[PDB]
Nucleic acid binder design. Structure first.
Ligand SMILES: O=P(O)(O)O[C@H]1[C@H](OP(=O)(O)O)[C@H](OP(=O)(O)O)[C@H](OP(=O)(O)O)[C@@H](OP(=O)(O)O)[C@H]1OP(=O)(O)O
Ligand SMILES: O=P(O)(O)O[C@H]1[C@H](OP(=O)(O)O)[C@H](OP(=O)(O)O)[C@H](OP(=O)(O)O)[C@@H](OP(=O)(O)O)[C@H]1OP(=O)(O)O
Ligand SMILES: [Zn+2]
Ligand SMILES: [Zn+2]
Lengths: 355, 384
RNA sequence: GCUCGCGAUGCUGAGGGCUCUG
RNA sequence: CAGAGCCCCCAGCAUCGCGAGC
């Protein structure tokens, strides 16, 4: 209960954890334009909240530097990187369940009636972003009392343009996408049921009408979702002491951290790789490694989708047929509302193996 | 009035004088300025025939946060920019005047044109005053009073010469356009990308091609040009001639009536003095017929109380719609139909849009950069 | 004459603090 | 709430020198 107290706690917890990871904000990698994070709650408590993930970044990869081997991060906007960090947590929580019977009590996952795994009662995830996400949620005049267009991130800069190959969808559109197909992605949907954010908390440029349109209301025309998939309508809130616009140059790097990690990981938004040119623990390849390790531990009869001898990344995603159908329904709802066609990257980029 | 320097001195004197009348002989708190500008209309040979159309002050552009998706905010409060917008109100009033009755046709500056719609009566000219050199190419390389002992520009073949330049939010310095960076966005500017505004040197060059009336008025009237640009200080003839026209002498394939205008360029006999103190945050505007100046917070693009200027895009669109309803179809210079959306209505000025296109290509072909526009969302509004 | 890098001295819209004032 | 005076601080130009390329 009390939306504004939750909002404040989530905002305070994520900022607090960012401090600890940056020598109380004094490290050069505390330099950020947008801060994001995910907080998990367990029961209608107060302070039984855990920061799951902490991220920064405002920039995307140049085309020259795109990987056809899953070694490069395509999108380093804080909120996108915070989701990917949550995927690392969810793989860890599946290994916790699977590695020892006595650890099943400590995992957020339990066996589901319907097959594979689902969350335990009252396990919720909350998204913090220090500003409203790029795209439709940020197309207004904050000093003033055709909308819902899908938008793409512009090659160089930090903002978006409407649509009608090398192009990334806005954060406003990706969170709307997460409010249909879940936050967990295609590959995790093979082990676990759809997972939604209960709350989206903004640290600035909060606006109830614009954010609700961006996040779900523009696609309430959505049709015939498979079972467990809903149009999720999370709690939307700003925070009590909002953050001021700081006009200037925006940093070139993106920070990420997941609960359990000893240190932040610093990526170059331009290359999608860390400062020494190695692959992130968040890239397609690294998440596919986590997924493959869990696929090795889960008996065939316990999968929510059939998939034996997984090799190519793209094939393994196509096996999540509930998810691919809810994605189709999503792509249709935007078209029929007159809001544009989702830009998908050419699926040679996902044609790689762990060979 | 026929001698370049007398006209130049009269234009300066009239704008100073009018600004004085409006600020209780410079006593009032809104007399405080760093840069003054104005438009004077001559309707013939004698000083009697000189009328001040507009007066403005200001040195500042809007803060990114305060951009209005309804066109209720002034984006650029550089004096010379505000003085042109004040002229636009005069031109709308003068069109409504012609249309009012047959008596009034005689007292309008406009007559029906042989080629459709309206044009100026013979010998109606406009003259722009700025108390200093316009920011960008006319100013950046020598923003100080000229000195006899200083021998003009020693390095006129430098790449930096003639370049399109932007004012940059929170940054001093008028900065070239670069090819690596691209398109400004609404969402980018709100979260803190610095808002870029094209320099006044670049905007007056534009006016010497597409005219001063803008896209909307071009649907009713033929292109209007400044006959003179007069600087009350920091006059440097070689930088100003380059900035105002000579750098895009390469421009081609202009629509009919559009041309590369080469206005008289001049300083004055007794240069204006450096205005003392900190640059005020407000911009003043006045058009002939107004009872008083309007004061705008240039940081917000609105007045002290948050109300829109008589000069904001919404007020100009409102003026255009009112005239649009009194001009019969057969007097339109353009028959192209567009939705009553600010952006869309400007696209009915097909010839103006083609002249803008030629302008942009000429800056690019000359190696002087690509023009930087506001985010496309700015002008996506309607009346109410 | 231009371009690039280095050095030097200068030039030209923000943020912060102190003081006074309305 | 606003304004001013003073200090502090934050991407282009000028001038001169050094090196190189054209
Ligand atoms: O975190 P993101 O940057 O938003 O990454 C997503 C994510 O890809 P990965 O999990 O492999 O990195 C989507 O994967 P799933 O929803 O299938 O789990 C995928 O979408 P599809 O593979 O379903 O097509 C793709 O998006 P897209 O192909 O639509 O461009 C991509 O987004 P980016 O390409 O923008 O990184
Ligand atoms: O130079 P300003 O007086 O500030 O105004 C101009 C003017 O816009 P408005 O009359 O609506 O304010 C131009 O419009 P036109 O009259 O030439 O049609 C427009 O250019 P576009 O029409 O191409 O939209 C735009 O310039 P831009 O979009 O290049 O930024 C803008 O300049 P500002 O944005 O700086 O105010
Ligand atoms: Zn984003
Ligand atoms: Zn200017």
């Amino acid at each position: 209960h009390l939306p504004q107290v939750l909002a404040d706690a989530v905002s305070r917890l994520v900022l607090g954890k960012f401090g600890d990871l940056t020598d109380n904000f004094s490290s050069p990698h505390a330099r950020r334009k947008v801060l994001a994070g995910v907080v998990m709650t367990t029961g209608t408590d107060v302070k039984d909240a855990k920061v799951i993930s902490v991220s920064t970044g405002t920039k995307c990869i140049n085309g020259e530097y795109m990987s056809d081997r899953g070694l490069a991060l395509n999108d380093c906007h804080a909120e996108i990187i915070s989701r990917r960090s949550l995927l690392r947590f969810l793989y860890t929580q599946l290994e916790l369940y699977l590695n020892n019977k006595d650890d099943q009590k400590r995992s957020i996952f339990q066996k589901s009636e319907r097959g594979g795994f689902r969350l335990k009662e009252n396990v919720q995830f909350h998204l913090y972003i220090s500003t409203s996400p790029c795209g439709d949620a940020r197309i207004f005049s904050p000093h003033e009392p055709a909308r819902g267009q899908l938008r793409t991130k512009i090659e160089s800069g930090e903002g978006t343009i409407p649509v009608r190959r090398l192009l990334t969808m806005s954060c406003s559109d990706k969170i709307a996408r997460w409010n249909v197909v879940g936050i967990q992605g295609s590959l995790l949907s093979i082990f676990v049921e759809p997972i939604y954010f209960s709350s989206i908390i903004l640290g600035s440029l909060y606006h109830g009408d614009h954010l609700s349109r961006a996040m779900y209301q523009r696609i309430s025309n959505i049709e015939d979702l498979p079972p467990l998939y809903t149009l999720n309508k999370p709690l939307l809130s700003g925070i009590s002491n909002a953050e001021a616009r700081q006009p200037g140059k925006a940093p070139n790097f993106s920070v990420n951290w997941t609960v359990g990690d000893s240190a932040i990981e610093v990526i170059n938004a331009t290359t999608g790789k860390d400062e020494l040119g190695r692959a992130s623990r968040l890239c397609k390849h690294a998440l596919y490694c986590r997924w493959m390790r869990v696929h090795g531990k889960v008996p065939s009869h316990l999968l929510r989708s059939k998939i034996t001898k997984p090799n190519v990344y793209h094939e393994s995603k196509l096996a999540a047929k509930e998810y691919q159908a809810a994605k189709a329904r999503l792509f249709t709802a935007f078209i029929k509302a007159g809001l544009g066609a989702w830009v998908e990257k050419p699926t040679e980029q996902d044609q790689f193996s762990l060979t």
